[PDB]
Amino acid sequence: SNAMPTTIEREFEELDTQRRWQPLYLEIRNESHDYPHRVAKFPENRNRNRYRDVSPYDHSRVKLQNAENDYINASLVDIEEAQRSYILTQGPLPNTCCHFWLMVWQQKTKAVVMLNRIVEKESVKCAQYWPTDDQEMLFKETGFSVKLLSEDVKSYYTVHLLQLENINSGETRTISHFHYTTWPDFGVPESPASFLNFLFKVRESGSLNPDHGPAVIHCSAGIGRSGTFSLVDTCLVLMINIKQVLLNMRKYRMGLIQTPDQLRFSYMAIIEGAKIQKRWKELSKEDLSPAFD
């Protein structure tokens, strides 16, 4: 243990007392690398993109193997230095839920992390791409079905245990679907504890470990909340220059972290995380029935 505050804690104190979060965010925007995204912008892919100005780079886009059109709005975010990769994607469209599950199958993904609500400020942000009851959800276009096996309902998140079936091979895989239900669009989690309680629930499943394909992280556009989650997880693993880590992650997917408050939150979560999981759990008020047996 060091008495000297970390480079990160030093930065946080300056930025807070000098009120420089908006200017730092501006620097990150202007210093962000630009790469081609021609495939995203082929006319035949228009109905595969939720938003006109969030596209994957050609160099890091996830390809749908063996399909007439291999395009999905999804990016492989690779941080070798941390032995972490993630796929960050948009909320699937009604027409791209089939592509989403084909991607999950092909990439050997074990966890989906969903950070958005289906409807936010009266706008549909995501299709209902997993079941809400005991009914089998069929994706005929790609030959997958999804069953809800069980769910763990907490006060601000739900863990859905899903069975994904490749209906052609008959093979199945159980997928952990971690749904954060109280993280507002263009907003931040209620507290560092609430976010860290969630991230460590994901970690404690094994789904982020290298024996599995990359976890699929999404929100609405797959950059704001998804970028916050990935930035915090990547920095905790590396524990560092957070500004440089974010600019490197942005080389793989445009626009990660969408607000100055998301950047400040990322700092606070990393400083809380870098240190207790029982304190996070109680402070998160995750339990709907906290009564002792």
Strand partners, 150: 161
* Resolution, expressed in angstroms to one decimal: 1.7
Given 97, 98, 219, 235, the catalytic residue? 219
> How many angstroms separate the CA atoms of 285 and 290, rounded?
9
On the CB side of 232, how many CA atoms lie within 13 Å of its CA?
A: 33
> What is the strand order of the sheet 61-63 is part of?
61-63, 71-79, 84-89, 215-218, 111-114, 172-180, 157-166, 144-153, 137-139
Indicate the annotated binding residues for substrate: 185, 219-225, 258
Q: What are phi and psi of 76, to 5 degrees?
A: -85, 110
Q: Which two tokens stand for residue 235?
A: 């920095």
Q: Which helix (H) or strand (E) holds 109?
A: none
Q: Which helix (H) or strand (E) holds 170?
A: none
126 is catalytic: no
Alpha helical stretches, state H, the chain: 7-17, 21-31, 97-106, 192-203, 225-238, 242-250, 260-273, 277-284
Q: Which two tokens stand for residue 30?
A: 């202007």
Q: Which method, experimentally, gave rise to this model?
A: X-ray
> How many angstroms separate the CA atoms of 256 and 22, rounded?
15
Indicate the annotated binding residues: 185, 219-225, 258
User: For the stretch 156-165, what's the b/e string if a residue is b when 16 or more beta carbons lie within 10 angstroms of its beta carbon?
Assistant: bbebbebebb
Side chain identity at residue 260, one-letter code:
P
Burial class of residue 249, CB neighbours in 10 A (0-12, 13-18, 19+): buried
Side chain identity at residue 205, one-letter code:
S
Burial class of residue 131, CB neighbours in 10 A (0-12, 13-18, 19+): middle
> How many angstroms separate the CA atoms of 226 and 252, rounded?
13
Side chain identity at residue 111, one-letter code:
A
